[PDB]
Structure formats: C-alpha cells, structure tokens
Amino acid sequence: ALPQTVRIGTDTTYAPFSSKDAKGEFIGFDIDLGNEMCKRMQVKCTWVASDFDALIPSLKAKKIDAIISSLSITDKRQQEIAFSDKLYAADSRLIAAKGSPIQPTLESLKGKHVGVLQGSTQEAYANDNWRTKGVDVVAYANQDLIYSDLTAGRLDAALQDEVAASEGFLKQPAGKEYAFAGPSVKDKKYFGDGTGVGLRKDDTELKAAFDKALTELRQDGTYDKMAKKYFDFNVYGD
C-alpha cells in the first residue's frame, strides 16, 4: 500500500540539485522533481536532510522511504536497492580551450595530457579506457590545480562531471575562454545510468507510483519547464 506520508532523504549540500535557501526551505532541481512527482502521486512527502553516506542506511532501516539526492543508478547500488526510472543523466565530459578540435576518442587524445581528479569515477574511466592505451592521463589531488593547469596550458583537457564543470567553472570568470570539447561520455560502468529515486527493493507499488508520475510530468512538458530554471542544456540526456 502506498505510505501515507513518504519521507524522502536528501543531502542539501549540492546546488543546483539540493540546497537550502535563506529561509531554510529545500530548493533545487531534485526538490522540484520530487515535489511534482508527490503531487501527481497524490501523497504527502516530507524532506529529511541527511548526509549522503547515511542515506542508503536510513532507507534500509526504514527511517526514510525514498532517496532523491542525485543518486546514480550503478550496478553496485542495484544489488542493494531499487531505483525509479532515470530523473536526469550524470555523465562526464571533456573541457578544453574554446575552439579546441579535441574529442573524447582515443584517436583524438593520443598525444594529449588529460587531467583527472585522483580517486574519482573519471580517473577510473580514463585509466581503463585511455591511459592503458597510451593517452597521458594525469591525476590531481585537487580540482583547483586541474583548472589552473588547464588555464596555464599544462593540460590539453580535463575530464570532469558535466554539470559540475558547467556550474562550477565554465560559468565562473575563469572558464570564459573554455568549453566542453565534444559530446558527454556515457558509461554505465563508471558513471551509472543517470540518477533515480532510491527505494527499498520490496516497495514495488511505491516504485510504480514514482515511475507513473515521472512519465506523466515528462509527457505534459512540466519536466522541461522545470529544467529550464537551472539548465540551458538537455539534462535528461538520451
């Protein structure tokens, strides 16, 4: 049976997806998506701020009923929990100097120096797909140093999370002469298959209810109106 009130956990330290405003209200694209789906589902939802690492523990313990916190649908989490259909994509993309002919192909990158953040999903992807094949992939302890090396011409490109690179560098003064080089790199093994509402594997009516509501708001155009506030590109992906 559907919960009388669905408690949704989110980590509010990730603008533009989940944050708190000056009044303490939850704001952001995940929050908009979440509230709209509860509306169509016709349930009461309550947002519970939580640290990201506590979210799947809290779900499993039944402290919350759903997670909407940019949670990407990876194979390893599918082992533990269930997911709604994709809410939006969470892919990576190369950033280079405006007008660069660089592409995310092995053909284009051989010879180049690509910076990657050490220990991220991007380094895993870049190491298996590109560094083993002779692209010079350099891993950085810190994101600041990646951006300064790119700016300094020490790096030819940086592989980063697409939305993070958009919001956090190509929109900053420092990124004005830089741009995405080529299309985003999609790989379910390293980046997952978009993000989705995290749910208990057993709660199939609640998954059905979120899936129905998400198709509806996508079909009547509400998804696009909502995305328009934050993103000038197709966040949904394919």
UniProtKB/Swiss-Prot annotation:
L-arginine binds at residues 11, 69-70, 72, 77, 121, 161. SUPFAM superfamilies: Periplasmic binding protein-like II. Keywords: Amino-acid transport, Disulfide bond, Periplasm, Signal, Transport. L-ornithine binds at residues 11, 69-70, 72, 77, 121, 161. GO terms for biological process: amino acid transport. Coiled coil: none annotated. This is Lysine/arginine/ornithine-binding periplasmic protein. The keyword Transmembrane does not apply. Changing residue 161 to A: Shows a drastic decrease in arginine and histidine binding affinity. The complex is composed of two ATP-binding proteins (HisP), two transmembrane proteins (HisM and HisQ) and a solute-binding protein (ArgT). SMART domains: PBPb (SM00062). Has a bi-lobal structure. Contains two globular domains separated by a deep cleft wherein the ligand-binding site is located. Part of the ABC transporter complex HisPMQ-ArgT involved in lysine/arginine/ornithine transport. Binds lysine, arginine and ornithine. Can also bind histidine, with much lower affinity. Stimulates ATPase activity of HisP. Changing residue 117 to K: Changes ligand specificity. Can bind glutamine. Still able to bind basic amino acids, however, with 1000-fold less affinity for arginine. GO terms for molecular function: amino acid binding. Its main location: periplasm. L-lysine binds at residues 11, 70, 72, 77, 121. The 30-fold reduced affinity of the protein for histidine is primarily due to unavailability of one ionic interaction of the histidine side chain with the protein which is present in the other three complexes. GO terms for cellular component: outer membrane-bounded periplasmic space. Changing residue 11 to A: Decreases arginine and histidine binding affinity. Disulfide bonds join 38-45. It is found in: Periplasm.
